[PDB]
UniProtKB/TrEMBL annotation, chains B, D:
The lineage of its organism: Bacteria, Pseudomonadati, Myxococcota, Myxococcia, Myxococcales. Residues 108-266 form the Phytochrome chromophore attachment site domain. This is histidine kinase. In the N-terminal section; belongs to the phytochrome family. The chain holds residues 9 to 306 of 747 of the full protein. It comes from Stigmatella aurantiaca (strain DW4/3-1).
Length: 278, 277, 278, 277
């Protein structure tokens, strides 16, 4: 292994991916306590200025409009002057975290089972390459199926993720079905303040959609020429069983409809993997 | 996974330990969706009856009294006709989960972990306290021991090697304190067996009363262990080790000394990291 | 104040507590220059006889055995015919001071932080009462937390040590983390000779474990019915910040393991008090 | 404490005054653990290089020559190629600390303190000498003054009241003599910034070269003070007062007259106590 990074607190890196914006706030006043340093391009004020403020005079008016279904359902589509956005709400460290990400406009045998899953996910995402790993007893990911376009750069990248995926990464994969790295060549954006005063550490990004990625893994994607990477967790009876990894040589937006279909497919596959016995 | 029992979804077992009571509810009406089957002795109605009801007409009034700091602080002590209780609130699967547990009434590196072992044994009063440090294969190595004179579980410095599954280590990372009040007690099922909105049992990752894997409960019984109380040692937010306390019978620890136990794990986490930078 | 005693040279009283024995010696011959008047019960010769002698024919053979780790580490446990003892070595006035004290046998918010410290120390010592003082800008100790057994003689002794703890006492508390008065009803033992010839004054007992206590404070403990008193200095960034005072109505040996855990706790607390800013 | 600067750990500032050099080492190998950053001009190697080395191959040979009386007497004069030096040895934090400072070459109660003031001004040659007596609130009261004709720091009988912090008075109690050679000079940092074995800087309570609190150094500069030389007046081992000498520029005092200064403080301590018993 590489113990120097297999103890990496990947939930505490204090950064997001640059295509979105993250805000966090506590209390009934809804006072901003965390804000990504890139937030001015979307919110019209400098981040150090927005700290301390209630969200009512911080969020764009289009978001505050949909605030009720946003709390109810945890997500809502909104149309900002900057374009279409997805808003996503979850709870963490006692803070309510708000993530804004660009969206399209809305105006007017077991190997055989996993092979069809591979082909199905590649059809839904359009990504060049899709790989399905199954974890063995040593938690090595075994390449079990591949779907790919004809004539490929990333050849047969059938190498196992061996003494590989650290426990903290597998724990996040268990708690989140979908993980998107929009562009491995893009730069992470730091969260402000660097440590949350109430916590003595950075905000926990375990369930954050925009969570920046361990540099060691981002470098592994870049060496492969991978731009976008989109991953689906395969659970069996609530336990991590495998991983579907989609790699595309450049950014390629997937869109919410086909992302949601991807997650439903992981739920359908979990049923099929468990019910095969009982 | 890591064998016949290391694939166990220990967060989804659907039970609590029998010394406490758990309720869960969604929505602004606060409609009961989850209830432990033992709840009648504390709430005065059958659980199958309390399902569907708002909490305002479900919880005892002493609890609803302190409901503001209970939501505010996440915990509050209350005095019920049955005696003193701790109420504990967290969110899970979109439900807000309330746990009621009885309480008393209210009117070098090896050397550092050696003192930690002696400090925890004095705070808990438990017969034996062990400090494990996890190596690179996530095997726990016994690094310090504090224990009373003349022991039944004498010198247990046998390592937990191909042992503590990832799901257990993940919960040790997310919760600083874990208490098994009595390994001879029986788990109490949560009702309904699967949450209708979820298709599975309520996720008990952050539950104080979460029941115990039958295989580990059986291993505790074989040792003559009654109570088991664990403190997670984190370094820079990553699981580093475990302080495991074993007692031959039940022994209440009490909130003051639990809270002192948790502060010590925070103090120790500073010392393990700041030792470098 | 009481200026008649707030200039008391409490480091120069020339006495020890009666439960231990103190020896001091200079030079490469290691010639006894200071000896407590109670030393015969442990060493088998009269103190005036042991003066001038090298330690090789003065110390018990069990102590001279462990002399190497005693110098190396500053402390060592030894088993004498009289029972188990702790030996403690430090330097003072150019003399090397040796203190022997009985030991058990070894054969086969900020207020919330200080409240847990109070409860933790009471658990480690077993003393009836534990009080935590924090010093304000006038160096008054403010009672900030209390841990105590149910149903108490020393009620709520929440009175501040006000125009109180003299500067010389606070200086010794800064230089020593742990201070034990084994029994406030016991009698101090004089050091011989009454003044050290080389110095023109008594041996400086600033860092002595057995140092006898100012009579005015010993009388204050007795009036409270206090037998044992065990104190821990709280430092922040090397400066005296507060004091944890343990009082027990009778003698109660604490034992080295739990004393050492007590001192580590004061070091851990000092980190938490300083790092809270930087 | 006693304000924004009266909590200052003046024994832990991690610097020395730039006119001298400090080394510290532990163990029987005499391994360098502390070294002032200015040490190369005197020892001929970079400080970061000398760390880890035994002193026998670190100190100049003239110093190791006199090493027996240096350990014996605690001080010895040596003649280096750079000129005459004083070597000074004491123990602190388990380290033995060696300080090198340049030296010249060697081939009623008010009335008593008035003569003491005139005696110290003649011994030091400094422009102004003040005698403070501490009252019961540990405020220093000006009790006698000796000074040259026509003064810049004319008649400074303003009291140091809510002033001299406890940490400064504790060091005045433990050291009879304190010299600030030049308040316009710059402190030299000790390397490494914290002692690895200690988690903090070396304790400089008994160091001759110990640097000065920035706030007090700035107050000296505002007065046009270059050199400052202090004598502690003890009565029965307790701090009683201070003789403070101020000079508008650096002025070496020389060991003979420093030693005479210290003997006078001992003679005065006899007279202040024996006046009763
Ligand atoms: C230092 C820790 C390591 C590590 C971290 C890591 N891997 C993740 C997902 C993942 N990694 C791989 C394969 C590799 N990643 C590497 O860095 C290397 C070698 C240098 C390899 C061979 C795979 C196949 C996967 C599954 C996802 C995929 O694209 O296939 C993650 C989580 C990333 C995230 O989404 O946040 C982390 C943190 N991987 C290691 O091998 C070691 C070096
Ligand atoms: C089937 C899975 C296994 C398993 C589950 C498990 N262990 C936990 C804590 C823990 N276990 C041990 C040691 C053992 N437990 C066993 O069942 C056996 C062998 C039969 C051994 C040797 C230790 C030392 C620890 C640390 C805690 C302690 O008391 O010392 C837990 C979490 C329990 C909880 O709090 O919920 C689980 C789920 N342990 C395994 O070894 C395999 C069998
Ligand atoms: C004449 C000097 C005084 C003095 C000396 C003193 N106090 C010490 C510790 C300590 N004292 C108190 C409280 C009191 N001590 C008293 O004598 C009186 C009044 C008569 C009071 C109110 C406290 C709270 C503490 C902290 C320790 C504790 O048990 O709480 C010491 C050092 C003793 C030692 O360990 O050597 C000295 C020398 N205290 C004064 O108030 C004045 C009278
Ligand atoms: C922030 C802490 C303070 C402080 C520290 C201090 N004083 C020392 C000796 C000393 N100071 C004074 C008078 C002053 N020093 C000041 O900074 C100020 C105001 C800005 C005043 C009025 C005197 C008279 C003395 C006695 C020595 C002398 O030269 O007269 C020392 C020790 C210096 C040393 O040798 O290391 C310290 C650390 N003094 C304070 O008044 C407050 C501000």
């Amino acid at each position: 292994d590489l113990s120097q990074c297999d103890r990496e607190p990947i939930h505490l890196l204090g950064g997001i991916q640059s295509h979105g914006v993250l805000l966090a706030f506590r209390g009934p006043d809804r006072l901003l306590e965390v804000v990504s340093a890139n937030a001015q391009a979307l919110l019209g004020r400098p981040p150090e200025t927005l700290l301390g403020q209630p969200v009512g005079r911080v969020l764009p008016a289009e978001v505050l409009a949909q605030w009720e279904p946003l709390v109810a359902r945890g997500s809502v589509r909104v149309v900002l002057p900057a374009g279409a956005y997805r808003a996503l709400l979850h709870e963490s460290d006692g803070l309510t975290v708000l993530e804004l990400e660009p969206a399209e406009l809305q105006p007017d045998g077991t190997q055989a089972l996993l092979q069809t899953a591979a082909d199905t996910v590649r059809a839904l995402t359009g990504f060049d390459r899709v790989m399905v790993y199954r974890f063995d007893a040593d938690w090595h990911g075994e390449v079990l199926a591949e779907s790919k376009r004809g004539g490929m750069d990333g050849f047969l990248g059938m190498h196992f993720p061996a003494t590989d995926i650290p426990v903290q990464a597998r724990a996040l994969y268990t708690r989140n079905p979908l993980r998107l790295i929009a562009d491995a060549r893009a730069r992470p954006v730091p969260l402000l303040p660097p440590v949350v005063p109430a916590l003595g550490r950075p905000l926990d990004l375990s369930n954050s959609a925009l969570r920046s990625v361990s540099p060691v893994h981002l470098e592994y994607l870049r060496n492969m020429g991978v731009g976008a990477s989109f991953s689906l967790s395969l659970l069996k009876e609530g336990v991590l069983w495998g991983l579907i990894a989609c790699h595309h040589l450049e950014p390629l937006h997937i869109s919410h409809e086909r992302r949601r279909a991807c997650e439903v497919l992981t739920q359908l596959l979990a049923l099929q993997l468990s019910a095969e016995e009982r």
